[PDB]
Amino acid sequence: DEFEMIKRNTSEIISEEELREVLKKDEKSAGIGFEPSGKIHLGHYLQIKKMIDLQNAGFDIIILLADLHAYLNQKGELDEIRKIGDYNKKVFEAMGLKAKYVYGSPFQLDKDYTLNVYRLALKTTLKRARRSMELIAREDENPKVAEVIYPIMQVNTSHRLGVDVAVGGMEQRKIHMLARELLPKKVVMIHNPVLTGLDGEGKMSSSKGNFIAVDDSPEEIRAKIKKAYCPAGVVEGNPIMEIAKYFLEYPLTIKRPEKFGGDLTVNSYEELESLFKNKELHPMDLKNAVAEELIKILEPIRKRLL
Amino acid sequence: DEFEMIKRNTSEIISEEELREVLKKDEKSAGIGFEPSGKIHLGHYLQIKKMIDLQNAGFDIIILLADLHAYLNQKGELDEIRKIGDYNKKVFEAMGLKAKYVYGSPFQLDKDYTLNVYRLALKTTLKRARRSMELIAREDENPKVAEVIYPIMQVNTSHRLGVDVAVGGMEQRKIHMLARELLPKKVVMIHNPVLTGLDGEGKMSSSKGNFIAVDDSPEEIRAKIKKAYCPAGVVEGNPIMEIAKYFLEYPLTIKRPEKFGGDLTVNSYEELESLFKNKELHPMDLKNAVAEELIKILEPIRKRLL
Ligand SMILES: N[C@@H](Cc1ccc(C(=O)c2ccccc2)cc1)C(=O)O
Ligand SMILES: N[C@@H](Cc1ccc(C(=O)c2ccccc2)cc1)C(=O)O
Numbered sequence: 001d002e003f004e005m006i007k008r009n010t011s012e013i014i015s016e017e018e019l020r021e022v023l024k025k026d027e028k029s030a031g032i033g034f035e036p037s038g039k040i041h042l043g044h045y046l047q048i049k050k051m052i053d054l055q056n057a058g059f060d061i062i063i064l065l066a067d068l069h070a071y072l073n074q075k076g077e078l079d080e081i082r083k084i085g086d087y088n089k090k091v092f093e094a095m096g097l098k099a100k101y102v103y104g105s106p107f108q109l110d111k112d113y114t115l116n117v118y119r120l121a122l123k124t125t126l127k128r129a130r131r132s133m134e135l136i137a138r139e140d141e142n143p144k145v146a147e148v149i150y151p152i153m154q155v156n157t158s159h160r161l162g163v164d165v166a167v168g169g170m171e172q173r174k175i176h177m178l179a180r181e182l183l184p185k186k187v188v189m190i191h192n193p194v195l196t197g198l199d200g201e202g203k204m205s206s207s208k209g210n211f212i213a214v215d216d217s218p219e220e221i222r223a224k225i226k227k228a229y230c231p232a233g234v235v236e237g238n239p240i241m242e243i244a245k246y247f248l249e250y251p252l253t254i255k256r257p258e259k260f261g262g263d264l265t266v267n268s269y270e271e272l273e274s275l276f277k278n279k280e281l282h283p284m285d286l287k288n289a290v291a292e293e294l295i296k297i298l299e300p301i302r303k304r305l306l
Numbered sequence: 307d308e309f310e311m312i313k314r315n316t317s318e319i320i321s322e323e324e325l326r327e328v329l330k331k332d333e334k335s336a337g338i339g340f341e342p343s344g345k346i347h348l349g350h351y352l353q354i355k356k357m358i359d360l361q362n363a364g365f366d367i368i369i370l371l372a373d374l375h376a377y378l379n380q381k382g383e384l385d386e387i388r389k390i391g392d393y394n395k396k397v398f399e400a401m402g403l404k405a406k407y408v409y410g411s412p413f414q415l416d417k418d419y420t421l422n423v424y425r426l427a428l429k430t431t432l433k434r435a436r437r438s439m440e441l442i443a444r445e446d447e448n449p450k451v452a453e454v455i456y457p458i459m460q461v462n463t464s465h466r467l468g469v470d471v472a473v474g475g476m477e478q479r480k481i482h483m484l485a486r487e488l489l490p491k492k493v494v495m496i497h498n499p500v501l502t503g504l505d506g507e508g509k510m511s512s513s514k515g516n517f518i519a520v521d522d523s524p525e526e527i528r529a530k531i532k533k534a535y536c537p538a539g540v541v542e543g544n545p546i547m548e549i550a551k552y553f554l555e556y557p558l559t560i561k562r563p564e565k566f567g568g569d570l571t572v573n574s575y576e577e578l579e580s581l582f583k584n585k586e587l588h589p590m591d592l593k594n595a596v597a598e599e600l601i602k603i604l605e606p607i608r609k610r611l612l
Contacts (some may be wrong), residue, residue: 072424111415118378121452126432129451145435145458146427148451 033064036085061099132174200229339370342391367405438480506535
């Protein structure tokens, strides 16, 4: 159905009941926000892919190019941030996402919007605010006041934009729980899993350089996956297995030499999971297959950006 | 001279050099802000008296009825706060202060003013911000985000108002130091001492009920001073001695029975300080004299409010 179609590959939906009530409505909107990023990676793609699922399910899509938030989170100057946001819009369009793209500053600095921010600041403890920025705040030995304004700003935007569904990675859940409590109208939160970095040490990040950009070249992709963390029989924290699960189409024909078993055909990721977990599928073979399928996947996108 | 006239009874002037440069200018402005208070006490009077000193010295006076700050500091709703601010203006006018009175919200919610607040939030650490609100923040077991917005708001207002001199109690110095660092144009800070409460346990405060309101009745004043902390020979932390120092005119004729030494005439507070410190002047006699002089002082003000 549509519900499960949307539920597929998500970490959680804050209230599947509320989401069912939403699917009944004729006009429904889903929204996601991104601090403009210099490089758009699989992490972003995973989420845009999810926005497309919702769109296919009749949701109007709202993409917030969060320039003010990025400004508050030390990403630089607004106009500079604004141009990177511009580029992101194109990469998002290149991914096949037809939607309403809006910057945050045009309305996030409005007289009333601000009074609402201060109203929320009166009900948001500093400890609660600091906690929600743990996975989002730019690393800083001397946390700025801006760090705690950021979360309440995100909450006021959810109010302003008035979407039925808000999508984001699991790292956004605390700011989302905060909004669930502070806001009068409860919005459904769809949380996407956070991909692991290629080296498997942490989560995939634009600043940690452990990602695969959607416009990376075929050679770059092959080289990135080749060096990627991928222990035989290990699925948890295996970035390569995550890519197979979140981006690959099945049945998947893992091509390999007869000398090693010959071409293998997997009808589902779960099946691939078994084969790899039971060490019947070798890392090098998993990689070559993921790398080639991924390249095909991203090609259309890279072509458009070029 | 004018300098010392302004320096009289102040705790500190952040840069007496800068203050001298200011006195040379033809047009100079001095400003002070108050979170609207239900009762205006000696603490406020001390500061308005100081604003008048500056006014007599050719300064244009700006009085900020800080409704937004009070809102941020949990004083209630803006309109309610706005009406108490209205009443304060009259009490201030009743004190003989002719000046420009402005609320903060009319300009503190402006698009650019807000972006400037966020700019400042990017250079103000949370620890630095928390520290400046130690003597100002409303008591709260769960510090709100609003607490740290307050200080940067005060700093942006100093920028906006563009006064040459900013006046306030010593409890405001950390927020003032913060402004000295963050702002491009350095404004002179004149800090007034903080009066001790009548019970001598803490500082005089509108919420601690240890103050003398300028419109208190003669009977109320007499009764408040009678019960006031005032150890014989002790000057430090003696609220009664502070009142004699900051509000009384000299020579001061301390009236008392011949049975106890008869009427005494002191030509200066310093002299009074000696007499009291050397236990030659009794607390009860100090009180009766301060109480009667204070009543005369405030009378004009109380009459006008009635
Ligand atoms: N916090 C996200 C960026 C972000 C997400 C969401 C928001 C919203 O307030 C929003 C957008 C769309 C719908 C509802 C709410 C602003 C900014 C990040 O770390 O990149
Ligand atoms: N913090 C003060 C109130 C306050 C003082 C000063 C200000 C200003 O920003 C200001 C006013 C006038 C001039 C310069 C600066 C705002 C609010 C209090 O505890 O009551």
